[PDB]
Amino acid sequence: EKITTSKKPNLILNVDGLIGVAFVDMLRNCGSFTREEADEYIDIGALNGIFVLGRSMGFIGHYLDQKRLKQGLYRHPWDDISYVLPEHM
């Protein structure tokens, strides 16, 4: 991060970067994992699961909010699509 923020001002560690490096830090740097158990949980994808179980709360919050504000069906109006179909196949 100290190297990259000299390239551009924005260029900070994301929270999606920081949870990744801090969770590998937790796994292969606390106890209870060897380096073939900690790296197997990374190769399998146990860092997908953190983002999924987190974002399920926000998804169900969006569901309950869209039901409680009682909105009807969304349609996505036709001036946002720009159909690009071929000529005559």
Added chain:
Amino acid sequence: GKSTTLFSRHTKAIVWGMQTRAVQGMLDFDYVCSRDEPSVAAMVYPFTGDHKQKFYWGHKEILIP
């Protein structure tokens, strides 16, 4: 008794029906006539529950039940 002053600058209405275009025009008229409140307090449509519609008081957005 039939009144003689039907409308005023404090006249409040309920429009019956789903008429977002016409009630948009009416709230546009309430804004452009320099009125304090909208002329429409509520809408009544029997096929839909109570919610709030968003409208433009100039640029600001308000909610009408």
